[PDB]
CSV table of C-alpha atoms in Angstrom, one decimal:
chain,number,residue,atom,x,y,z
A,1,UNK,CA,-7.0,17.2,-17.3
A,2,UNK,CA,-7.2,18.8,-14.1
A,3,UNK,CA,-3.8,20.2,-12.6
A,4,UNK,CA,-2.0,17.1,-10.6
A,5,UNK,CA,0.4,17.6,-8.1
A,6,UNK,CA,4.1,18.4,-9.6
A,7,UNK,CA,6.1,15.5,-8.0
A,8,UNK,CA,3.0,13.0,-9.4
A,9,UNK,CA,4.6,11.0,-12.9
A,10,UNK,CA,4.0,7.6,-13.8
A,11,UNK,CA,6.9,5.9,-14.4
A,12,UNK,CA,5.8,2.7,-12.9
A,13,UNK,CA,3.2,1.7,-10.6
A,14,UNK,CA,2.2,4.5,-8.5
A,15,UNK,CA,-0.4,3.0,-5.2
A,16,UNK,CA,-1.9,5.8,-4.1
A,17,UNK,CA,-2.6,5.2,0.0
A,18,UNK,CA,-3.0,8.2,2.9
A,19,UNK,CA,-1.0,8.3,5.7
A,20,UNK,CA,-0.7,5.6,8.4
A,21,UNK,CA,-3.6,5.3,10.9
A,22,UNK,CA,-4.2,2.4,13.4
A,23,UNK,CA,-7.5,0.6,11.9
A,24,UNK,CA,-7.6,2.3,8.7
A,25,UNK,CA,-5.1,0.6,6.4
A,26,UNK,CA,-6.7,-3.0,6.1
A,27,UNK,CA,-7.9,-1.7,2.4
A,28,UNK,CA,-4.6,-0.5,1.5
A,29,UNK,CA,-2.3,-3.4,3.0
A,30,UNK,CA,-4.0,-5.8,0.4
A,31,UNK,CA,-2.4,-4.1,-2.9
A,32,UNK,CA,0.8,-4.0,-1.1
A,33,UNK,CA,1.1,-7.7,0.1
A,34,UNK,CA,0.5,-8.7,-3.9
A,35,UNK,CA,3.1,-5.9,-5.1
A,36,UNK,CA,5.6,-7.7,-2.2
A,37,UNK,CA,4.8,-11.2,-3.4
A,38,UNK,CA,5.4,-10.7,-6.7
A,39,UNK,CA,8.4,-8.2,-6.6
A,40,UNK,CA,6.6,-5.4,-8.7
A,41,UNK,CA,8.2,-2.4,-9.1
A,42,UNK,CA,6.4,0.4,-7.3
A,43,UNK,CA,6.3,3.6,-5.6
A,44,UNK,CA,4.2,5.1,-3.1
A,45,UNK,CA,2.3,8.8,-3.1
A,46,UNK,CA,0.9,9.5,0.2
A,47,UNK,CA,-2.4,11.8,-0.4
A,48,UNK,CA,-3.3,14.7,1.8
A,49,UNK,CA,-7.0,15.5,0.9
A,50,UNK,CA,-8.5,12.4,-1.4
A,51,UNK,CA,-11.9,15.0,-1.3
A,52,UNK,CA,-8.9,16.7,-3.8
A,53,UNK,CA,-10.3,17.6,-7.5
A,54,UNK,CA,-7.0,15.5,-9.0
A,55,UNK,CA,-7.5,12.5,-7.1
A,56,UNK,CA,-11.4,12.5,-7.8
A,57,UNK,CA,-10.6,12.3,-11.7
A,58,UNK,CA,-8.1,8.9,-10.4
A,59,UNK,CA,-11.1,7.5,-8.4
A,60,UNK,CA,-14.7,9.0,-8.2
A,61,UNK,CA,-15.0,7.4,-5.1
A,62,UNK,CA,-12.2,9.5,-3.6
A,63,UNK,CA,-10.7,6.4,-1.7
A,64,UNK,CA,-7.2,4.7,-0.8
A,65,UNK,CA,-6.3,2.6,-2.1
A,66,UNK,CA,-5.7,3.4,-6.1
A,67,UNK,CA,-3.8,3.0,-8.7
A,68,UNK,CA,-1.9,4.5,-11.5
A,69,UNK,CA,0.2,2.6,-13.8
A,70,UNK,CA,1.7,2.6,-17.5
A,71,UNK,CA,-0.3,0.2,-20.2
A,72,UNK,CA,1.9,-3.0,-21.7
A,73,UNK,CA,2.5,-1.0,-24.7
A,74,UNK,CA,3.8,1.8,-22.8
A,75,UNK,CA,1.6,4.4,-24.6
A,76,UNK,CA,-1.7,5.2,-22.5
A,77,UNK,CA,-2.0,5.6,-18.6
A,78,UNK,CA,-4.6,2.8,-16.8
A,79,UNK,CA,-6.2,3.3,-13.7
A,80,UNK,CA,-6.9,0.7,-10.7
A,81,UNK,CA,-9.2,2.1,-7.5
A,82,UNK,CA,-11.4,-0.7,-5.1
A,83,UNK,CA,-9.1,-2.6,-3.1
A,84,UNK,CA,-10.4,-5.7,-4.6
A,85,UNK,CA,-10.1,-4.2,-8.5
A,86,UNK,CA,-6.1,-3.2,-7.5
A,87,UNK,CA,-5.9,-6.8,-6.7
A,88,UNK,CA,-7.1,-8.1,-9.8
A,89,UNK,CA,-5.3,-5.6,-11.8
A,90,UNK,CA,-1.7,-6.4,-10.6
A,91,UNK,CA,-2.9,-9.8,-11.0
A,92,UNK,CA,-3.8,-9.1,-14.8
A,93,UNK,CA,-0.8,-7.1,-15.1
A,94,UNK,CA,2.4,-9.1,-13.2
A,95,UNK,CA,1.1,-12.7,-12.2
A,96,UNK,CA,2.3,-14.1,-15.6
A,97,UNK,CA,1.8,-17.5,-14.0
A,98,UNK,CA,-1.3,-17.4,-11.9
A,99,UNK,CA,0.5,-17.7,-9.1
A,100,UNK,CA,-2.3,-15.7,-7.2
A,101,UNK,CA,-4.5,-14.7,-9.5
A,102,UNK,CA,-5.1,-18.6,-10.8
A,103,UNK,CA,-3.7,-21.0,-13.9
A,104,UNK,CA,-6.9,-22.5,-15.2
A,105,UNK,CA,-11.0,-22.0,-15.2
A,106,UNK,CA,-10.9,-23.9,-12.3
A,107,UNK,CA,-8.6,-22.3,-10.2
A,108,UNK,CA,-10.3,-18.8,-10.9
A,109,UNK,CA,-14.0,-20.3,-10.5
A,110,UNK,CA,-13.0,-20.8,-6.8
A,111,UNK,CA,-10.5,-17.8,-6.3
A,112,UNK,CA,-13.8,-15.1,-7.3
A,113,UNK,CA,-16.3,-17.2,-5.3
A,114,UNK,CA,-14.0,-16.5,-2.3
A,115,UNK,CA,-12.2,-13.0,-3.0
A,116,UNK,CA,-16.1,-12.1,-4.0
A,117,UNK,CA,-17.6,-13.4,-1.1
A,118,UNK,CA,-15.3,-11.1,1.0
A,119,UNK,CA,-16.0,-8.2,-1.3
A,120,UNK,CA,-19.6,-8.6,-0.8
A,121,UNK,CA,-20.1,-9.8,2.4
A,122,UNK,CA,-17.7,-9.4,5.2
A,123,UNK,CA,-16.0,-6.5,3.1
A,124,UNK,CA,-18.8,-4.2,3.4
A,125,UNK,CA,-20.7,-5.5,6.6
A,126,UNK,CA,-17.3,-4.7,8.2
A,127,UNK,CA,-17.1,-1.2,6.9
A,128,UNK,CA,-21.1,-0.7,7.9
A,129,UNK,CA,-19.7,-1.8,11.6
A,130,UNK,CA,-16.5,-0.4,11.2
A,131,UNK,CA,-19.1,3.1,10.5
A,132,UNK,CA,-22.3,2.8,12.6
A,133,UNK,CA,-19.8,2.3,15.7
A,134,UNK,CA,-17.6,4.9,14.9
A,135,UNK,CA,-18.8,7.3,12.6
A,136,UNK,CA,-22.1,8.1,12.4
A,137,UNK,CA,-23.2,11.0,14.8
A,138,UNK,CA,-25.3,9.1,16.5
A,139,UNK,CA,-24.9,5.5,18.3
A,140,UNK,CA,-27.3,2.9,17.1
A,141,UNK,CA,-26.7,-0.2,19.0
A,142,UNK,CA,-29.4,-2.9,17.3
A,143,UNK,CA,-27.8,-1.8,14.2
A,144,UNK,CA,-24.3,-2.3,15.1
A,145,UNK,CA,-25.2,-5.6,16.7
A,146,UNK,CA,-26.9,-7.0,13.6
A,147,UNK,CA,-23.5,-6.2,11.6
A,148,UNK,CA,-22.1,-7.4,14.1
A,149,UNK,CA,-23.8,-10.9,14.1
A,150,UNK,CA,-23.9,-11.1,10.1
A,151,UNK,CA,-19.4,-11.2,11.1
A,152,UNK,CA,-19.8,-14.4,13.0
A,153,UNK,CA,-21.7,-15.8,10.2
A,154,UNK,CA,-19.0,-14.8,7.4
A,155,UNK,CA,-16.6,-16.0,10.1
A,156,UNK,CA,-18.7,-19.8,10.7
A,157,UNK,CA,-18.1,-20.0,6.6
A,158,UNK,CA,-15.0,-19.2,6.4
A,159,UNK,CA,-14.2,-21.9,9.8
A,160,UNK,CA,-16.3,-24.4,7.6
A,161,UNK,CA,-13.9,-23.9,4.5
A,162,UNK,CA,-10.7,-24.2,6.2
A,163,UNK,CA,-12.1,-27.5,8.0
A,164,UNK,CA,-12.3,-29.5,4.9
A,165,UNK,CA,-9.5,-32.0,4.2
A,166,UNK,CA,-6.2,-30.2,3.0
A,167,UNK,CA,-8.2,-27.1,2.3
A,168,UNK,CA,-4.7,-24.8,3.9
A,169,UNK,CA,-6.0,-21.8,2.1
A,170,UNK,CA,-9.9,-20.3,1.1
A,171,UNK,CA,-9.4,-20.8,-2.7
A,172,UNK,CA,-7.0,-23.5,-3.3
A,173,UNK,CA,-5.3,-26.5,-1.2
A,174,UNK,CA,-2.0,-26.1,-2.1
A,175,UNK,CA,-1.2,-21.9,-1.8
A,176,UNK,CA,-2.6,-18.8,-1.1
A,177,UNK,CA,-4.6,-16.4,-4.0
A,178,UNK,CA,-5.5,-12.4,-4.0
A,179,UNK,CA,-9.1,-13.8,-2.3
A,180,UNK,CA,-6.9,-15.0,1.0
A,181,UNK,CA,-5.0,-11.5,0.5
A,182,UNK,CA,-8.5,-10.1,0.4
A,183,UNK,CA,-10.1,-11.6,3.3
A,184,UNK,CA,-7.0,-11.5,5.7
A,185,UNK,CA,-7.5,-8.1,7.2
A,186,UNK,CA,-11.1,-8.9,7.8
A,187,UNK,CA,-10.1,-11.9,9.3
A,188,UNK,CA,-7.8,-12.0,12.0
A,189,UNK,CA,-7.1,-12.0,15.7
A,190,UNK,CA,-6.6,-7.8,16.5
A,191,UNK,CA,-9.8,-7.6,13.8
A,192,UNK,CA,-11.8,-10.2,15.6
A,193,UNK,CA,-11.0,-8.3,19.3
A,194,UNK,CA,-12.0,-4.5,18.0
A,195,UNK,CA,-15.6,-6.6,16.6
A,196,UNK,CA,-15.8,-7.6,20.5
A,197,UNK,CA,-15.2,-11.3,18.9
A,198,UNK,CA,-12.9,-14.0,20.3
A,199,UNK,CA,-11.4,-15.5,17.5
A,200,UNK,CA,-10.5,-18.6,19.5
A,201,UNK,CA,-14.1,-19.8,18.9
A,202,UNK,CA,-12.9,-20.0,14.6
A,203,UNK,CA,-9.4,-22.3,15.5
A,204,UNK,CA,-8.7,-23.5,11.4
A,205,UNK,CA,-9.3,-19.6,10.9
A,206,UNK,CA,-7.0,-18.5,13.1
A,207,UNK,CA,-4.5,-21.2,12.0
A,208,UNK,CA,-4.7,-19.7,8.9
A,209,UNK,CA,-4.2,-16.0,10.0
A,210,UNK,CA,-1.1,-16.9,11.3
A,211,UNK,CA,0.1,-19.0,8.2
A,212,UNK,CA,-1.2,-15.7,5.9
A,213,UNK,CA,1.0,-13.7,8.5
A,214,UNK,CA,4.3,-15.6,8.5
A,215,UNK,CA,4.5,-14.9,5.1
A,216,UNK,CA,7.6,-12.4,4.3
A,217,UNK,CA,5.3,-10.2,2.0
A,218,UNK,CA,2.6,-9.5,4.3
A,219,UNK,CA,5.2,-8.9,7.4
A,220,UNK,CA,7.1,-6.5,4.9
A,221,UNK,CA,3.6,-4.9,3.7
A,222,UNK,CA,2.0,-4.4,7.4
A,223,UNK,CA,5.7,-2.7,8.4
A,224,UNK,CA,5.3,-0.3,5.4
A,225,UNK,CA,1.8,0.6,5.7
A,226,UNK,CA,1.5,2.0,8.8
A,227,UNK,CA,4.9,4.3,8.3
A,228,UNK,CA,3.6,5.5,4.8
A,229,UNK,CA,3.5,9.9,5.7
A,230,UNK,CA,5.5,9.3,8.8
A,231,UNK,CA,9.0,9.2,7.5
A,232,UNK,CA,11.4,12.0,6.2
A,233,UNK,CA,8.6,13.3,3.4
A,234,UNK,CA,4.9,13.4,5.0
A,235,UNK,CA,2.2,14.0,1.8
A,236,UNK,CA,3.6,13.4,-1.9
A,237,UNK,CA,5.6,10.7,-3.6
A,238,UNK,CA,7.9,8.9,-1.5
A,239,UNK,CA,11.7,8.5,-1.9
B,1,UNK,CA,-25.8,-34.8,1.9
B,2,UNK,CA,-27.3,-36.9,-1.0
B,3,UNK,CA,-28.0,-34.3,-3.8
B,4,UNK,CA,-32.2,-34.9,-5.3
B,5,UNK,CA,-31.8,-37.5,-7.7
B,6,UNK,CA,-32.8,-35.0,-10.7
B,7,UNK,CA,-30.0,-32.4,-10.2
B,8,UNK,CA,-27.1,-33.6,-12.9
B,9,UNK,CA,-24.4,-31.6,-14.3
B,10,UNK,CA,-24.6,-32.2,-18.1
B,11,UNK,CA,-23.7,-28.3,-19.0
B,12,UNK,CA,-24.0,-25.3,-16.8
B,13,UNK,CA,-26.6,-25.6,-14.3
B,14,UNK,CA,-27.9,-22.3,-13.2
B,15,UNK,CA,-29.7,-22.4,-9.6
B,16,UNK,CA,-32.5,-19.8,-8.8
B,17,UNK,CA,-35.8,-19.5,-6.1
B,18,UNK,CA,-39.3,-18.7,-7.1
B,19,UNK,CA,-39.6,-15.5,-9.6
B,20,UNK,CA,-41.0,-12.6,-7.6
B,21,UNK,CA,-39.9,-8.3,-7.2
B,22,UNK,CA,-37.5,-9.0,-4.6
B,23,UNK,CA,-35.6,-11.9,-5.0
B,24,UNK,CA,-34.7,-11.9,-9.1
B,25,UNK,CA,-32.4,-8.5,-9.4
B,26,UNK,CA,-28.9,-10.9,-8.6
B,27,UNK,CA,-30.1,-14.4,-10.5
B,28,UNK,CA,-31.0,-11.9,-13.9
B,29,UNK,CA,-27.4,-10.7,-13.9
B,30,UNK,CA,-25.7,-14.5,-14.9
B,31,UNK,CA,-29.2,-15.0,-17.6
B,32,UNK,CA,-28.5,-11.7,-19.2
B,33,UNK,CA,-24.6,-12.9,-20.1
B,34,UNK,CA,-26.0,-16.5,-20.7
B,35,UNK,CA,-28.9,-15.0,-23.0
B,36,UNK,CA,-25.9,-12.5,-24.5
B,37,UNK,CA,-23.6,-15.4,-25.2
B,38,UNK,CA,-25.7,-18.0,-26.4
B,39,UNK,CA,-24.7,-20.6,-23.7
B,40,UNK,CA,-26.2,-24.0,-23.0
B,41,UNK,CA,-27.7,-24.2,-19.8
B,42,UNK,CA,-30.1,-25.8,-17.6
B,43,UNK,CA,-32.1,-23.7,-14.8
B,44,UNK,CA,-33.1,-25.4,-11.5
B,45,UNK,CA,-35.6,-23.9,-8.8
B,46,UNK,CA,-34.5,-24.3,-5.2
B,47,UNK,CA,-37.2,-25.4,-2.7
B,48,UNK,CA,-34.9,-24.4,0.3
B,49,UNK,CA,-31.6,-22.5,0.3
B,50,UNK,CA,-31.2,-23.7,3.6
B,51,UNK,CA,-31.0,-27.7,2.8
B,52,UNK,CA,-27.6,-29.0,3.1
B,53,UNK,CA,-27.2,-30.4,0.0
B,54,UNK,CA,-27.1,-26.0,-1.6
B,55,UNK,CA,-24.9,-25.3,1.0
B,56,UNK,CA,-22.2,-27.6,-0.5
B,57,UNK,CA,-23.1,-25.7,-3.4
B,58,UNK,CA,-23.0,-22.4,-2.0
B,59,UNK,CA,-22.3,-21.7,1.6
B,60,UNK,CA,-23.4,-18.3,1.7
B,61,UNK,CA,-27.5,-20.3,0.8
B,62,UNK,CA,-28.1,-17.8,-1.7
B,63,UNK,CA,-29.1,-18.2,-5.5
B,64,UNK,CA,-27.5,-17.3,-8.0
B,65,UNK,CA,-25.5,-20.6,-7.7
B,66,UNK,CA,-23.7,-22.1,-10.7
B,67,UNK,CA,-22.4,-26.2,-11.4
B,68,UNK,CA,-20.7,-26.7,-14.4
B,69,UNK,CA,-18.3,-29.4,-16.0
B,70,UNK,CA,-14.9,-28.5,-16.2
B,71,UNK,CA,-12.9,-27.4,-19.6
B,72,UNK,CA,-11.2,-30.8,-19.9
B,73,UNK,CA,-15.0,-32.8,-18.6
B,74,UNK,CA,-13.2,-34.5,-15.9
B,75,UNK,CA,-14.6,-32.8,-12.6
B,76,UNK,CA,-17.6,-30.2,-11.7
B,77,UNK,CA,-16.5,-26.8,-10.8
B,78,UNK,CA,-19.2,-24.1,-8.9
B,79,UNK,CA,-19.3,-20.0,-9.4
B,80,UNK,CA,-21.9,-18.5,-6.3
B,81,UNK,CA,-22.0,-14.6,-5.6
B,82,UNK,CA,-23.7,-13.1,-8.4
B,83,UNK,CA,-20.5,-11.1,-9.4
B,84,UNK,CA,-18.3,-14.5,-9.2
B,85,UNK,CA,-21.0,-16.3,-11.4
B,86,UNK,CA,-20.5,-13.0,-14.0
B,87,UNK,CA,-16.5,-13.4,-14.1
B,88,UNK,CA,-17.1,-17.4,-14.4
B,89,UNK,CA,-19.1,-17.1,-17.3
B,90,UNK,CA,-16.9,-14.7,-19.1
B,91,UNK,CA,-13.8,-16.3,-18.7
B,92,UNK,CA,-15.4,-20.1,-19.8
B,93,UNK,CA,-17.8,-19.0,-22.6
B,94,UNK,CA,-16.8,-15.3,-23.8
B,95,UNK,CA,-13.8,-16.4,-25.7
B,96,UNK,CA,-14.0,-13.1,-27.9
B,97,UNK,CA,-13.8,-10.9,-24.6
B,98,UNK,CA,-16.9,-8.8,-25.8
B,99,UNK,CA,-18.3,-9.1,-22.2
B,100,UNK,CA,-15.0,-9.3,-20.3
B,101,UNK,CA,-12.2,-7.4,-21.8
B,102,UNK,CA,-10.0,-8.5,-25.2
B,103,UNK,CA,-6.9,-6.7,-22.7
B,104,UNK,CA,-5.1,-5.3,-19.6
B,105,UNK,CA,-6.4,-1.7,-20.4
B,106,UNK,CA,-9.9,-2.6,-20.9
B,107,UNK,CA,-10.3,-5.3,-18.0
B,108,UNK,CA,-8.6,-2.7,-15.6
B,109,UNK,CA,-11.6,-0.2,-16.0
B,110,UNK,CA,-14.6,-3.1,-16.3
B,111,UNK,CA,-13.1,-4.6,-12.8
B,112,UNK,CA,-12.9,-1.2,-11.2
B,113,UNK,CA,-16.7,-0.5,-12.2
B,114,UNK,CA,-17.9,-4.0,-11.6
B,115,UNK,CA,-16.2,-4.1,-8.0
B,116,UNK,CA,-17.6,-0.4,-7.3
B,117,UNK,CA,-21.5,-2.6,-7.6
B,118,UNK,CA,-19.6,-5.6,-5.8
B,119,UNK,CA,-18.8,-3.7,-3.2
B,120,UNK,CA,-20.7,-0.4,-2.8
B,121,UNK,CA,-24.3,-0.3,-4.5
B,122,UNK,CA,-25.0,-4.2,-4.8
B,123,UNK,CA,-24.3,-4.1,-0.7
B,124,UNK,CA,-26.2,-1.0,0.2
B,125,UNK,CA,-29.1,-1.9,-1.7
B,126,UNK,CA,-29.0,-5.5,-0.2
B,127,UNK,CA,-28.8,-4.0,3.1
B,128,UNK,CA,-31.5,-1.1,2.4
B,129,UNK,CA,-33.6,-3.8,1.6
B,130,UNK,CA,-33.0,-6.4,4.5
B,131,UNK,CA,-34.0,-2.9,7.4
B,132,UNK,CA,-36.9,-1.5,5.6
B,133,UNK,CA,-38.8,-5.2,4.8
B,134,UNK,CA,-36.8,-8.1,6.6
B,135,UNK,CA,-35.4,-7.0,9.6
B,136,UNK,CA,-38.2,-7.4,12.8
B,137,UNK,CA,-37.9,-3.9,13.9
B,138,UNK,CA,-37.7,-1.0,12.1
B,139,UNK,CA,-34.6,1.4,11.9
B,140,UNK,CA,-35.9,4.3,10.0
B,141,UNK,CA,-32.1,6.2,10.6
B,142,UNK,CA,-30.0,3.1,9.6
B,143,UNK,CA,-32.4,2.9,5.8
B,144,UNK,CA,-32.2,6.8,5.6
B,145,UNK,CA,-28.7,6.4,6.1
B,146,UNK,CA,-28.2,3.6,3.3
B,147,UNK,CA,-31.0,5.5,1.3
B,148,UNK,CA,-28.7,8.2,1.0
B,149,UNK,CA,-25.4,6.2,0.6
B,150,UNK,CA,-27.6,4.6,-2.9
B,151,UNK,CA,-28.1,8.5,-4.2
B,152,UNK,CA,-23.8,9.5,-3.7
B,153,UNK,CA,-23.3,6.0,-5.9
B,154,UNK,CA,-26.2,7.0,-8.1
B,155,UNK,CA,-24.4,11.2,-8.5
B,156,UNK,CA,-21.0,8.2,-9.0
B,157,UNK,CA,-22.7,6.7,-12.0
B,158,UNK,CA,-24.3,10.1,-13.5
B,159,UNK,CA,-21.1,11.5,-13.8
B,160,UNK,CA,-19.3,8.3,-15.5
B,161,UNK,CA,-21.6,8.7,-18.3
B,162,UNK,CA,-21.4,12.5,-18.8
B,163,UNK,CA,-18.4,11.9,-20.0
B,164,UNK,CA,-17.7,13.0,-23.3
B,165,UNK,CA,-18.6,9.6,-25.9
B,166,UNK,CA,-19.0,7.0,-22.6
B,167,UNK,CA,-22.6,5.2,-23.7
B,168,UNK,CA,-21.5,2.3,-21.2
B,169,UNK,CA,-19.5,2.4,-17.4
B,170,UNK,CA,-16.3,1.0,-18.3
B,171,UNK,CA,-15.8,1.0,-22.1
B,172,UNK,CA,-17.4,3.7,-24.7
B,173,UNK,CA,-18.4,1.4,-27.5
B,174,UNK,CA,-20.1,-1.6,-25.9
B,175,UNK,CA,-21.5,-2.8,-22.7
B,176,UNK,CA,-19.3,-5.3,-20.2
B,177,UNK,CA,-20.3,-7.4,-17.0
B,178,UNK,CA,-19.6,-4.4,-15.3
B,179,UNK,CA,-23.1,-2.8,-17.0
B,180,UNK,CA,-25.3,-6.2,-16.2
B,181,UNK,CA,-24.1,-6.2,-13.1
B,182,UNK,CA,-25.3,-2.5,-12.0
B,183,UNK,CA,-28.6,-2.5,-14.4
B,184,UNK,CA,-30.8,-4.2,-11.6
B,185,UNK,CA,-29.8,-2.0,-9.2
B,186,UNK,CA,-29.7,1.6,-11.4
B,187,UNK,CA,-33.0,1.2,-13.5
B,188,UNK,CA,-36.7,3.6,-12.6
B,189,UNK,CA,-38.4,0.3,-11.1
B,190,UNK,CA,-35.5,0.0,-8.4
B,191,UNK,CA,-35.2,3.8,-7.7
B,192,UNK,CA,-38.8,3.9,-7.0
B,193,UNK,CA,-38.7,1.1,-4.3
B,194,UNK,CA,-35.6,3.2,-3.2
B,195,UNK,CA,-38.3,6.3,-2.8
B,196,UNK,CA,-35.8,7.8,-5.4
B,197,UNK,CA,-36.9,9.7,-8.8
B,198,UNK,CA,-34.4,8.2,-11.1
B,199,UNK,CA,-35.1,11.9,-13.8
B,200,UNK,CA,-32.7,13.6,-11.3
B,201,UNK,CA,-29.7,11.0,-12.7
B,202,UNK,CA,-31.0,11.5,-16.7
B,203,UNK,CA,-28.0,9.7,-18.1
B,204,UNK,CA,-28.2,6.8,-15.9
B,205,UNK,CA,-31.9,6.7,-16.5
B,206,UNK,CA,-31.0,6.9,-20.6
B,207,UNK,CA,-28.3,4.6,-19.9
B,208,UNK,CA,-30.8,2.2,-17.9
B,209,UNK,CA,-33.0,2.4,-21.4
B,210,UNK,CA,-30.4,1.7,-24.0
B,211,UNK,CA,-28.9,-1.8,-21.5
B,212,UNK,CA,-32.9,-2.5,-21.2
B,213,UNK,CA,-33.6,-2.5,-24.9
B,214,UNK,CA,-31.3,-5.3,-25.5
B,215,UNK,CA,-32.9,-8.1,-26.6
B,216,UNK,CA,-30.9,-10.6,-23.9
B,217,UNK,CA,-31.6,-8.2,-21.2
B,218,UNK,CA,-35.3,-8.6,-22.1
B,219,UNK,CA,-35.7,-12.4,-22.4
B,220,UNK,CA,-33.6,-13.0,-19.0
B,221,UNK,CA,-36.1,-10.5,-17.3
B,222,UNK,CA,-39.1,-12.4,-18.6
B,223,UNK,CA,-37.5,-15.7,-17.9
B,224,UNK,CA,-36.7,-15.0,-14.6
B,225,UNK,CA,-40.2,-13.8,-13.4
B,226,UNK,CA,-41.2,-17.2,-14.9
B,227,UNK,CA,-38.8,-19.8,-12.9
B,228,UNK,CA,-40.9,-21.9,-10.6
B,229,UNK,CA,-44.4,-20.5,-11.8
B,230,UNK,CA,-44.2,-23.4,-15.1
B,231,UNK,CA,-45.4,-27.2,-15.2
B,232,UNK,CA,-42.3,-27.6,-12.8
B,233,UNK,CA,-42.5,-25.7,-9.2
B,234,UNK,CA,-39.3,-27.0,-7.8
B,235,UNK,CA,-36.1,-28.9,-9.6
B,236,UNK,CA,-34.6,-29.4,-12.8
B,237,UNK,CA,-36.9,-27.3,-15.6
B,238,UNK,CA,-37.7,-29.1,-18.9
């Protein structure tokens, strides 16, 4: 039990993020839009240092975003860490009805084929990018082209989705799911112009990535995000 | 596109390629929890993942792809991504939650160490793969790179399972999807391709053992080698 910060106790859902930085909350925005959709009660602890001992024993990956909640019986502490595991978790947790998370074996069979196929695929191929071009020390071009190329494929599939009849969402027809929560980050105009990408070329895409962000929740959740550490109290739980 | 006139959806149709070293380590991960549940399925061995009639299947033209019927028998439904084809599987067919989680607490850590493959090793290693055998040219910095991104998931895993009375990633007692899903990638057969020796992680390597030892684990690897190499090279198997 390694000492945790004073001012950390879990008296509801605690989503651990780091402070606000252009680029670098498109993991940590996806929790957030659910916990806005649904109403959860929540606070927020901005981390300083997630290389941090404490954090490390909350996720070993020693990433935002994670999560620390109270179990249904109220006895034990759980744990959620991977963007797409927080999304299942609230899910599990707060979407009595399915309203995101899905009603049926149906429903589900399509919502993991798609929330997957961004956790898998563009997910990763877009941090690779995200790192190569950024990151790494050194610039390596044919790499960052090829990631950049496997984008426009994930892109072409998700264009060929959204141009089926009635198909308004990835998952389902009739409403968005935590896999269209999931993908949205990964998928949008601002996104598409730092991969060097006109989106204009994916239109049912881009229709959609405006429908996604109309949506109160994710308007509300985009707001927050990039304040989190820049308000009255910088590192710590928020007031 | 007009499906081959052998492909029909009586149960849960599991779709794979030829068996060989490198294109078996995703299509095992569904036959282990299959072989594990005792589920009735049918396997079929596709020619070309790039015919049109898969990608209605699976867009991504990859194997593994599931059809199945629905619940009620009405309509078929389809699972593709070898971690989407895990989740399907459990919630039709593991009714007892042995594989999945019987609650909130126990599905909370099996989805955090499932996505943590999902997203982290199954990905690396897929890309590791693609630069050092598939790609034209060769990027000796980019593998290196990914090479070492597989050994800080590998130190990830080690130390999950020196904790005190965890035999298994996500719960201490039995394994989950969360364990099939990592196995292919975190056993001494991979590690070696990976130039890795797997002794330096001895827990994952004992872990490795113990999943290996089941007796699903080993009919879905010798099944899998098979698929294609039988009376039937491509299609429906008998």
């Amino acid at each position: 039990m390694s000492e945790r910060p004073s001012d950390l106790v879990v008296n509801r859902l605690v989503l651990f993020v780091v402070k606000g930085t252009a680029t670098a909350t498109h993991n940590t925005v996806k929790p957030l839009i659910l916990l806005e959709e649904l109403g959860v009660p929540h606070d927020i602890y901005v981390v300083e240092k997630v290389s941090a001992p404490w954090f490390s024993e909350i996720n070993p990956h020693k990433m935002v975003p994670a999560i620390l909640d109270r179990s249904p019986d109220g006895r034990d502490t759980l744990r959620a860490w991977e963007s797409t595991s927080t999304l299942m978790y609230i899910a599990d947790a707060y979407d009595k009805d399915g309203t995101f998370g899905g009603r049926n074996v149906q429903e589900r069979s399509e919502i993991n084929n798609w929330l997957t196929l961004h956790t898998a695929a563009l997910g990763p191929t877009a941090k690779y990018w995200l790192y190569f071009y950024k990151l790494h020390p050194e610039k390596l071009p044919k790499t960052i082209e090829k990631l950049r190329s496997n984008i426009t494929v994930q892109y072409d599939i998700l264009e060929r989705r959204l141009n089926e009849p009635g198909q308004q969402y990835l998952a389902l027809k009739d409403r968005p799911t935590i896999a269209d929560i999931a993908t949205l980050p990964f998928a949008m105009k601002s996104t598409a112009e730092l991969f060097g990408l006109e989106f204009e070329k994916w239109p049912k895409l881009q229709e959609w990535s405006v429908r996604m962000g109309e949506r109160e929740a994710v308007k509300r959740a985009w707001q927050r995000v990039a304040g989190f550490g820049h308000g009255e109290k910088e590192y710590g739980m928020l007031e």
